[PDB]
C-alpha cells in the first residue's frame, strides 16, 4: 500500500544518487511534482517530465552530480547531499513563520506546503506564511 509516497520518492532519489543513476522514475502526483519543480528550480535536479510505464504514469527525475575526483576513489561529489522527510504521516509538523527552519546557514533548502502553495523556506518567508514542513534538502 505504501504509507507515505513523499518520503518514498525522496528515498528513490537518495538510493539512486548514491550509485549515480542517470535518472529514476516515481508514481505520478500533482503534489509530488511541486516538490520536484522546486527541487529543480533551486538546482538540485536537472528537471523532470511525466512518462508512462505499462500504462502507469510516472515522473522521470534526471539526477545532477559533481565532477570526477582526484586520488583514490574518484567518487564524484554529490549535488543532493542530504534529503530528509520532516513532516511524517505518523507525526505531522506544522510551522508558523517566526520559527521556520533555517537549513545549514542558507546553504540549504527547506520546502514546505502552504496556503499559497508549495514554497521553499526563503520563498515562504517572502509572502510571510507557514504550513506543513514537507522536508529539508542540501
- Helix, strand or coil, per DSSP, at residue 89: coil
* One residue of 42, 51, 58, 60 binding another protein per CB under 8 A: 42
Indicate whether 28 belongs to the interface with another protein (CB under 8 A).
no
φ and ψ at residue 125, rounded to 5 degrees: -65, -15
- Look at the block and give the residue holding cell 586520488: 71
DSSP state of 107: T
Tell me if 11 sits within 8 A of 61, measured CB to CB. no
Tell me if 48 sits within 8 A of 40, measured CB to CB. yes
Identity of the residue, 72 or 90, whose beta carbon is nearer to RNA in the bound complex: 90
Span 105-134, contacts to another protein by CB under 8 A: 105, 107-108
- Look at the block and give the residue holding cell 520546502: 111
Instruction: Tell the smallest beta-carbon distance from residue 64 to another protein (Å).
Output: 5
* One residue of 64, 101, 122, 132 binding another protein per CB under 8 A: 64
Q: What does DSSP say about strands 135-137 and 83-85: parallel, antiparallel, or unpaired? A: antiparallel
Instruction: Tell the smallest beta-carbon distance from residue 14 to RNA (Å).
Output: 7
Residue 110 binding result from RNA, another protein, none, given CB thresholds of 5 to 8 Å by partner type: none
* One residue of 30, 68, 92, 98 binding another protein per CB under 8 A: 92
Residue 79 binding result from RNA, another protein, none, given CB thresholds of 5 to 8 Å by partner type: another protein
Amino acid at each position: 500500500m505504501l504509507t507515505d509516497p513523499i518520503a518514498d520518492m525522496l528515498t528513490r532519489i537518495r538510493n539512486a544518487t548514491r550509485v549515480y543513476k542517470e535518472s529514476t522514475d516515481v508514481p505520478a502526483s500533482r503534489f509530488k511534482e511541486e516538490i520536484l519543480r522546486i527541487l529543480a528550480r533551486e538546482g538540485f535536479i536537472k528537471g523532470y517530465e511525466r512518462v508512462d510505464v505499462d500504462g502507469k504514469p510516472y515522473l522521470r527525475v534526471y539526477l545532477k552530480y559533481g565532477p570526477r575526483r582526484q586520488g583514490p576513489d574518484p567518487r564524484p561529489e554529490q549535488v543532493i547531499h542530504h534529503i530528509r522527510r520532516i513532516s511524517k504521516p505518523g507525526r505531522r509538523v506544522y510551522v508558523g513563520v517566526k520559527e521556520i527552519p533555517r537549513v545549514r546557514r542558507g546553504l540549504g533548502i527547506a520546502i514546505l506546503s502552504t496556503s499559497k502553495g508549495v514554497l521553499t523556506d526563503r520563498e515562504a518567508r517572502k509572502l510571510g506564511v507557514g504550513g506543513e514542513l514537507i522536508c529539508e534538502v542540501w
